[PDB]
Write a protein that binds this ligand. Structure first.
Ligand code: ZN
Ligand code: ZN
Lengths: 278, 278
């Protein structure tokens, strides 16, 4: 199994992660489980998902990493939440369709795939974040904001005033905020302004790992910046410097360190949210 | 040469045009020529290009057409204009990178490719249209707005208030407006508001052709709507119902019917613009 990045002919000088990377970090079936919720939430609040509308990430050598939102990271936690009784809505800054890292799609998962198929339109024809934000008030029916990981979360989200307003609303209004892997990079939207996440702790994909993955061809080059240290400059605490599939809780801020943490984050979020709404 | 659409593995159920389509409508070298401008424009006005930030177009059968801006259509006219002394700037509604139909890129063109390479950053890191519009005034240094074709021009542009404001500025301020193929679909941004293009005539890709190309696999399905008739409802006149590589002029509105018209549109635009600015 080669460690060389693979060609994405759709774009100019763009690559998918190497075969080795894929054999070691993806699988045709997920580790989705523990989906037992006999007493589901019966209210109206939904999960607001802020997804990636861009697939290509430029690396330090000019090459583009063909990324986007991680399917395992996005789907598992929503599967648990949907099962727990929480439906979801999807939004992107531009309003353009969600861009997934399909090379990580568990195409043979007899549960995840049909769940994906039955909500495909929500991802394909998302709402424009700004439109959602304009209607926000203390009574808005969103029980939580979910920012899934995938390197696509590094594009736009970390510098969007819309994401900032959104996060500000959620925190100020005592709502849940869920994220994993690189999803917390969006929290950087709060720099230069009121930062209600100051002093919060989370786990996430460590910058240290991003400096190693290209060695195995997960990406065609190095990142041009690291969200970990920036978040630390923004007054946030990152508790891990490695990948173990762990999850963490700081009040209503629920996070995960990687796709290996997706199933666990689902359980944690479902458990925490059910208890709050019942 | 097969007439079956080809798979774009980067996306879910997305396809590039068939081999047949490509053998008959693309080429490793363009028909770029007649680039003779001994007395180039020596002012500051630039060409403002409004490009596509989305590559995937949903068809009537749920399948996605892997499109974007047509490289021949985009590059040839800018090559002539740049040669004529007019540099250019690129903007997209979202600010995300320009998405090209690389399957039409003349990868062996010893002129177009280097010209592309030397301006790549303008396409990759475009300005956000709204930002450009906010700074617009009668003295703004844009001699023309260029909306290249490609089916990607059908996404977002036809319903963007930013594009409407932009076109309104150009017309009201006696600037040139250039477009071809599906690029004029962006003119539909003017519906529901002041429409300074009412009564204008142009040539463009005929709806009739869009209803045939899928038969040869250029697209994986049929369009969900046709910009031709809408433009007609908006008070515009489309002079052609076929593809001949022709170009047309209506005051400062310069257009083309397809990629076969790109080289000619370049000459026309360069000629017309030089005469106006000198
Ligand atoms: Zn559902
Ligand atoms: Zn130049």
């Amino acid at each position: 199994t080669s460690k060389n990045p693979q060609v994405d002919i759709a774009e100019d000088n763009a690559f998918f992660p190497s075969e080795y990377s894929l054999s070691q970090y993806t699988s045709p079936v997920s580790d989705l489980d523990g989906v037992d919720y006999p007493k589901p939430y019966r209210g109206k609040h939904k999960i607001l998902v802020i997804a990636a509308d861009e697939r290509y990430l430029p690396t330090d050598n000019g090459k583009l990493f063909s990324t986007g939102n991680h399917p395992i990271e996005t789907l598992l936690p929503l599967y648990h939440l949907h099962a727990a009784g929480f439906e979801f809505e999807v939004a992107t800054i531009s309003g353009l369709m969600t861009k997934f890292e399909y090379w990580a799609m568990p195409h043979k998962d007899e549960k995840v795939m049909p769940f994906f198929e039955q909500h495909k339109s929500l991802f394909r024809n998302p709402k424009k974040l700004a439109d959602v934000v304009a209607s926000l008030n203390a009574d808005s029916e969103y029980a939580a904001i979910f920012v899934p990981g995938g390197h696509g979360a590094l594009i736009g989200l970390p510098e969007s005033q819309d994401v900032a307003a959104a996060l500000q609303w959620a925190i100020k209004n005592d709502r849940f905020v869920i994220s994993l892997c690189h999803g917390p990079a969006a929290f950087l939207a709060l720099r230069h302004g009121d930062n209600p996440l100051n002093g919060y702790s989370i786990c996430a994909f460590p910058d240290a790992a991003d400096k190693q993955t290209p060695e195995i061809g997960y990406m065609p080059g190095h990142l041009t910046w690291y969200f970990g240290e920036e978040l630390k400059k923004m007054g946030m605490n990152i508790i891990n410097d490695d990948i173990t599939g762990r999850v963490h809780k700081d009040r209503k801020l629920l996070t995960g360190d990687s796709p290996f943490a997706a199933n666990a984050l689902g359980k944690l979020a479902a458990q925490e949210m059910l208890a709050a709404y019942a």
